[PDB]
Amino acid sequence: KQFAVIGLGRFGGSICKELHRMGHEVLAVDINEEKVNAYASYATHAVIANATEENELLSLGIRNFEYVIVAIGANIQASTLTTLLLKELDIPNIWVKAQNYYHHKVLEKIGADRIIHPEKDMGVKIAQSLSDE
Amino acid sequence: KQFAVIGLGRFGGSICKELHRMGHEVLAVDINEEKVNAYASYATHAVIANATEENELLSLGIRNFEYVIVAIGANIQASTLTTLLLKELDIPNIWVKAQNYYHHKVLEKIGADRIIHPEKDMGVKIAQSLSDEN
Amino acid sequence: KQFAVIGLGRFGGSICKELHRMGHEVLAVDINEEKVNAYASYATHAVIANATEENELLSLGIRNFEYVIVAIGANIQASTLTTLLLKELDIPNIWVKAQNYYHHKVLEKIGADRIIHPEKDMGVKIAQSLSDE
Amino acid sequence: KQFAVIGLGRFGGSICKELHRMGHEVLAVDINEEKVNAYASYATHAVIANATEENELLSLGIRNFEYVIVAIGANIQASTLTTLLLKELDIPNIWVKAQNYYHHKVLEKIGADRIIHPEKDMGVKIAQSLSDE
Amino acid sequence: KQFAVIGLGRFGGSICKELHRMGHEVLAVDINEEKVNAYASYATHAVIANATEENELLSLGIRNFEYVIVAIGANIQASTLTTLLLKELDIPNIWVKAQNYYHHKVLEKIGADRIIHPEKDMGVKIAQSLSDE
Amino acid sequence: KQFAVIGLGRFGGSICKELHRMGHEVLAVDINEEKVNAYASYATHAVIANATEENELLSLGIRNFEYVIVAIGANIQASTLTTLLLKELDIPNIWVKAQNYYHHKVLEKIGADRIIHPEKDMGVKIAQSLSDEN
Amino acid sequence: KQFAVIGLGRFGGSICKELHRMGHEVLAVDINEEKVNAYASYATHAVIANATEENELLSLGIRNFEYVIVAIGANIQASTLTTLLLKELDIPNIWVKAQNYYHHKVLEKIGADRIIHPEKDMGVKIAQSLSDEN
Amino acid sequence: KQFAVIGLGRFGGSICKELHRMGHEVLAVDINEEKVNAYASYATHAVIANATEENELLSLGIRNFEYVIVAIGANIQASTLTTLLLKELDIPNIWVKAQNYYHHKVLEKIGADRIIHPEKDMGVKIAQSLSDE
Numbered sequence A, C, D, E, H: 001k002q003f004a005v006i007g008l009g010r011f012g013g014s015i016c017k018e019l020h021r022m023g024h025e026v027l028a029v030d031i032n033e034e035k036v037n038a039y040a041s042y043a044t045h046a047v048i049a050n051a052t053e054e055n056e057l058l059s060l061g062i063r064n065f066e067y068v069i070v071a072i073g074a075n076i077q078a079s080t081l082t083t084l085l086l087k088e089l090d091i092p093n094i095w096v097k098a099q100n101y102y103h104h105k106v107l108e109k110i111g112a113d114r115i116i117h118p119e120k121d122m123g124v125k126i127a128q129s130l131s132d133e
Numbered sequence B, F, G: 001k002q003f004a005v006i007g008l009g010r011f012g013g014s015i016c017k018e019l020h021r022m023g024h025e026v027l028a029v030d031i032n033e034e035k036v037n038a039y040a041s042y043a044t045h046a047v048i049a050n051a052t053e054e055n056e057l058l059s060l061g062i063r064n065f066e067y068v069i070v071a072i073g074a075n076i077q078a079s080t081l082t083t084l085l086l087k088e089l090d091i092p093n094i095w096v097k098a099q100n101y102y103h104h105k106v107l108e109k110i111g112a113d114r115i116i117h118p119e120k121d122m123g124v125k126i127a128q129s130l131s132d133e134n
């Protein structure tokens, strides 16, 4: 019921739209103003903020959210830095989207609860569908 | 048992590796020679060919394969052109990886059996996992 | 007499201006509002619409037009998608502007009556002019 | 019979291929080595040279050629500078490919015998074909 | 008394300041807003406009000015295009600042009354001062 | 008759060419070898040397030259360092080309006999020409 | 006890914080207002001023300070010009942070009591630590 | 006696020169060929290699070296990735140069034995020198 998604892109935006359809309260935060306006109606709360600043994260109230999904793409440093800040806020579950194998290793060692690799993870279940078909 | 994957990238390469682990015969075709060499051991047959040429597709024997997966990325025209050629070869099932919404619409109307959107489709099942995780 | 041009750019805009001079009824449709305003006086009907939506095409009345020219440039997917929709509307003649060799092949197989390659096609007639000169 | 084409791109390359088919001697000059290698078999003489340097132009023997076509694209300064050098070499006929309206005006005033606008010029003859059809 | 300077840079700004000290009416036009604000007090009229647009030049009233100095630097195309527009406005005297030898040749042939090369022209008078010293 | 120009660029090269035309002996020194070769015929003596090294300056014989012009551009530190070395060699007249206002202040306080600002100084005489023309 | 630091950056800011911890009176001057506000609590006196203007330096009272540290970075001309002004104010000890080898030479000849090269000087003591660590 | 320095820049190059003077065997590795040539005489072994590739690190023999100093600057990802690879090679002591506070935190959590901040660390000892003076 209490979910937060950081980064409204192809992967992050899809999570907000799907969660909103199921009837869940989702907080969407993104630096780009156009992304927040587009997903303003698809999220319970839409915020234009920078996730790499610890002062803004406290203003949003991320510590309240049990699940935080960091879906920042094409900016690996922002994704790595955001998750490191979230552990200081003792977030119980942090789900991070990885970009490559090296980024996957860094996120694992800095304390990411679950690492998502949308291109690689989709292949291993498309292949599973082929066997079942 | 008879699968063909076109385009050995992040999405296409993952399918070949996973299918090979399960014990399936997979044909891997890619224009780039480095990709084919890397996945030569992970595929039953690895071929360096261009999927946009109908003469090369007949040489491989794609008509034999019941399932063909077009995993070409960052080259939308090659992905669109390859699937159009495959329908001429009366391929029963063609699975195509889409890049954006506009590419999804084009593939649907040209006769793609199943369209895959790895970034968008993963989000709708990650969100499903969140609900099931309470 | 009944012509429709989709995409008011360097190639599409030149067709509307030349046809208007000859005294022909031309319908101009383009997503960009500035392009439609600029060519509003150079076309019998100017419409701000998206050619990739089949609902808007029926509103314009494209099925009435015998000749439809798809002059969309720099957006290959929009050009490919528009021509595929037009064949559903049983348009007799569809002329499409191609961007590269791969786009030329796709348009040919999806049922484009005539494919135009302005950069390549101009070279083969400039060269012809050199021989005649 | 004696033609020279400068810049082996979409427009320049099409002229060399078409002239070669008709059986004409064409000299192809381009800074990029890949372009010259690709069109080496499609031109009687292929040269890797920079057209903005007056010393290299004399080495090629451009003054011998009666017709010189400057098909440099995406580099307006190189196209403008090349044609200015050619007039010093008293080239009888110089055909230049223009990029926009402002480039068309500059080429006209610096002494270009014929200015070609492939995107705009193709539209005025596609529109003519529509009327004749 | 009636002077116009286009481009408020190191060379253009120095002309406005020196002319203002001598008691002359100078119109300063520049695209950058910071440059116009800095030289607003050093010019009789300061305008934020683009010199490459013929519509804006007529609004300023450049045709009234007998002397127009085009001091645009680091943007050779803007400098070349601006002077070509000014000749359409039948400006009696046009003084242009050149960037290199090739730019000097282009400006001379498009009808620049006087071409200024601040780096090169200063050397020929510093050397003259050495002989007189 | 005895002039030395350091830095063969747009400003430094113009001084050597103009002085050579008037019939003066000019020594041209520059780190770049292409610049020295280009201006070898336009100078009585052309030398490929670094002006920031005091050992090379003595080899050239700069102390003999009464007028030394430091026309180094785009390298403010080299221009500032060269003029500081020249004062140790008790050069009577040192003319330096400045790059900006801050560089003008530094050169003035380190003992530059005359500071030249080609972009700014040309404007104040172009403006003077406008007044005399009207 | 009487120290002045000019330029509140990575190097200048570290000096003010460390001196403040030890219990010393430090004057911090910087053109940027955000830097002065950030280090206002870490310095006894924080001033927003330009060090290249001799009128502002007298207002601060730099002549009173025995030690002045010029930690201006990325603006070599400001660093060079500031130290030249300080010698006119007969400052006993002037410590300057250098940017490169050429800037090091200029500062040495204009009368800098001690020149600091944080990147180079840290390497020669990290290497010393390696030898002592066996 | 057995030291390896990765990245021949202002900080890395100073370590190699100082260690070479003291009479120590230093291996210098850098992607840039000019840096390796300049420091070839100042290091016992100079190698042109990429530290982000685990295959090249084994070729050099980094596992033999007890002390490895990662002095990569202006490329934070290369510095972070290199140190992560070194821990797989069970390097006893790894000294890393940090760029900012956020990079300092990441290196600390991924297992850097000692983190060096040349700009910040020099200030705390210059200030110490002032008190002692």
Ligand SMILES: Nc1ncnc2c1ncn2[C@@H]1O[C@H](COP(=O)(O)OP(=O)(O)O)[C@@H](O)[C@H]1O
Residues within 6 Å of the ligand: A006, A007, A008, A009, A010, A011, A012, A029, A030, A031, A032, A035, A049, A050, A051, A052, A071, A072, A073, A074, A075, A078, B119
């Ligand atoms: N520091 C940041 N804080 C919050 N959101 C960010 C930050 N940096 C980037 N983003 C957002 O993350 C999104 C990443 O999208 P993109 O790079 O297109 O790949 P994807 O859509 O797969 O995530 C961007 O839309 C951007 O707005």
Ligand SMILES: Nc1ncnc2c1ncn2[C@@H]1O[C@H](COP(=O)(O)OP(=O)(O)O)[C@@H](O)[C@H]1O
Residues within 6 Å of the ligand: A119, B006, B007, B008, B009, B010, B011, B012, B029, B030, B031, B032, B035, B049, B050, B051, B052, B071, B072, B073, B074, B075, B078
């Ligand atoms: N015409 C083609 N025929 C076969 N394979 C192709 C063709 N064009 C591209 N490919 C392959 O498809 C792959 C696409 O990978 P990429 O663009 O990185 O995205 P992804 O890894 O998500 O597929 C490339 O590795 C390339 O080798």
Ligand SMILES: Nc1ncnc2c1ncn2[C@@H]1O[C@H](COP(=O)(O)OP(=O)(O)O)[C@@H](O)[C@H]1O
Residues within 6 Å of the ligand: C006, C007, C008, C009, C010, C011, C012, C029, C030, C031, C032, C035, C049, C050, C051, C052, C071, C072, C073, C074, C075, C078, D119
């Ligand atoms: N989906 C669309 N529907 C209608 N018009 C479009 C669409 N997408 C782009 N266009 C128009 O097509 C034109 C293409 O112009 P451009 O890309 O500059 O190349 P060209 O001028 O050669 O056509 C654009 O001006 C744009 O307004």
Ligand SMILES: Nc1ncnc2c1ncn2[C@@H]1O[C@H](COP(=O)(O)OP(=O)(O)O)[C@@H](O)[C@H]1O
Residues within 6 Å of the ligand: C119, D006, D007, D008, D009, D010, D011, D012, D029, D030, D031, D032, D035, D049, D050, D051, D052, D071, D072, D073, D074, D075, D078
């Ligand atoms: N200075 C030059 N001299 C000769 N050829 C050039 C020069 N600059 C660019 N070219 C060539 O001109 C060609 C222009 O092609 P491009 O910019 O793709 O547009 P187009 O194909 O329409 O000409 C390039 O392939 C380039 O190799």
Ligand SMILES: Nc1ncnc2c1ncn2[C@@H]1O[C@H](COP(=O)(O)OP(=O)(O)O)[C@@H](O)[C@H]1O
Residues within 6 Å of the ligand: E006, E007, E008, E009, E010, E011, E012, E029, E030, E031, E032, E035, E049, E050, E051, E052, E071, E072, E073, E074, E075, E078, F119
């Ligand atoms: N299209 C334009 N119209 C008017 N002013 C322009 C235009 N383009 C550039 N300028 C101005 O011309 C000035 C050129 O300055 P710069 O490039 O620094 O060299 P300089 O100072 O020697 O002229 C810039 O400050 C810019 O504001």
Ligand SMILES: Nc1ncnc2c1ncn2[C@@H]1O[C@H](COP(=O)(O)OP(=O)(O)O)[C@@H](O)[C@H]1O
Residues within 6 Å of the ligand: E119, F006, F007, F008, F009, F010, F011, F012, F029, F030, F031, F032, F035, F049, F050, F051, F052, F071, F072, F073, F074, F075, F078
């Ligand atoms: N340390 C040095 N000693 C001698 N000459 C130098 C030194 N550094 C640079 N130069 C020369 O000074 C010239 C400066 O030219 P440039 O930077 O193009 O501006 P300008 O042409 O206006 O002087 C360069 O051609 C360079 O060869």
Ligand SMILES: Nc1ncnc2c1ncn2[C@@H]1O[C@H](COP(=O)(O)OP(=O)(O)O)[C@@H](O)[C@H]1O
Residues within 6 Å of the ligand: G006, G007, G008, G009, G010, G011, G012, G029, G030, G031, G032, G035, G049, G050, G051, G052, G071, G072, G073, G074, G075, G078, H119
């Ligand atoms: N003229 C000046 N007077 C005073 N302070 C200055 C002046 N110019 C720059 N500074 C300050 O010096 C600091 C230099 O910091 P920076 O360039 O980041 O490198 P570092 O942090 O290593 O010193 C800047 O924060 C700036 O505020």
Ligand SMILES: Nc1ncnc2c1ncn2[C@@H]1O[C@H](COP(=O)(O)OP(=O)(O)O)[C@@H](O)[C@H]1O
Residues within 6 Å of the ligand: G119, H006, H007, H008, H009, H010, H011, H012, H029, H030, H031, H032, H035, H049, H050, H051, H052, H071, H072, H073, H074, H075, H078
């Ligand atoms: N992947 C890499 N492997 C090895 N060396 C690298 C790599 N990336 C950068 N370097 C080297 O590290 C050096 C960093 O220097 P620089 O960025 O100037 O800052 P500093 O001199 O303070 O280290 C560069 O000279 C570069 O050659």
